[PDB]
Amino acid sequence: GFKQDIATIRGDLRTYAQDIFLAFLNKYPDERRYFKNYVGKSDQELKSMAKFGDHTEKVFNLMMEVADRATDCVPLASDANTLVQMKQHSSLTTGNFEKLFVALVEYMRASGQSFDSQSWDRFGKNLVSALSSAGMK
Amino acid sequence: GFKQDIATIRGDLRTYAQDIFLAFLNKYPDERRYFKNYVGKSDQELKSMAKFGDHTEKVFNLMMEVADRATDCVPLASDANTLVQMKQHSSLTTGNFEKLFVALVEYMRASGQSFDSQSWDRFGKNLVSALSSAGMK
Ligand code: HEM
């Protein structure tokens, strides 16, 4: 289920985090504009950058804590507030998160590993609603 | 589902509030001690007492407000704090609330009417968690 999925991802986190984030950037290549130096590179070239695995791992470390502090796939408002107030996310709107979760759910459905993909879709929807409640445009 | 149940109960709030509150007292008769004016009264005598219909409808109106503001049956912590800080609830513990929700779910499963009874049991569990976080014993 969703709670065990968090342990699945945590057990091989840099591999899942890069694979999911690459699925997001390949599904929505225009989203590369929020990052620096990601355009113009294939997946293997991104994975050998200095910063790419380390930053994607940090993103998923935090995503999994948000998911673990949730009840029934509903994140805490304080975790939504932190994501809205991070200076690194000052340019974003909730649509950027919904695209990330659409790609994440598609990855889980396609994978050989069992995941509770419907609960990740619901968690993404609930996080978008919480980000909007916390004031993201 | 749970959102429709809020509308079903709302639509005839006096009748459902009285029926569920009496199901509570009749399953857990020791709970009637907290309502000193209802001691020794039949159900029709209760229904002749203005405060009984008025105050039970108010209880259920507030429950429905808390249920409608929940996300995926997870209530707001602010709503749990209201219920804990009410002077009328000074002497209670989370087990009183657990009893009410066991009776409410039993009533739903026995009724003709369709209800998403599993969701009301999970809402009751999540609400007792939030009452305890908000300082109920
Ligand atoms: C629940 C979803 C997300 C979480 C948990 C999250 C978390 C974080 C974290 C922890 C960092 C710090 C990375 C570091 O400095 O090492 C970061 C940076 C950043 N985030 Fe997010 N983020 C999320 C979603 C998004 C989305 C959807 C976008 C844009 C489409 C985005 C754009 C950015 C950018 C531009 C940075 C700084 C640039 C960089 O790391 O290269 N984030 N994020």
Ligand code: HEM
């Ligand atoms: C989610 C569940 C509950 C809600 C929403 C709730 C709500 C309320 C409200 C709105 C009132 C004020 C009624 C008025 O003055 O008109 C009230 C009074 C009161 N509540 Fe609750 N209550 C809940 C659970 C409980 C439980 C489980 C108990 C005890 C076993 C309890 C014991 C009482 C008592 C003793 C009063 C004062 C009686 C009166 O003056 O009518 N409540 N409640």
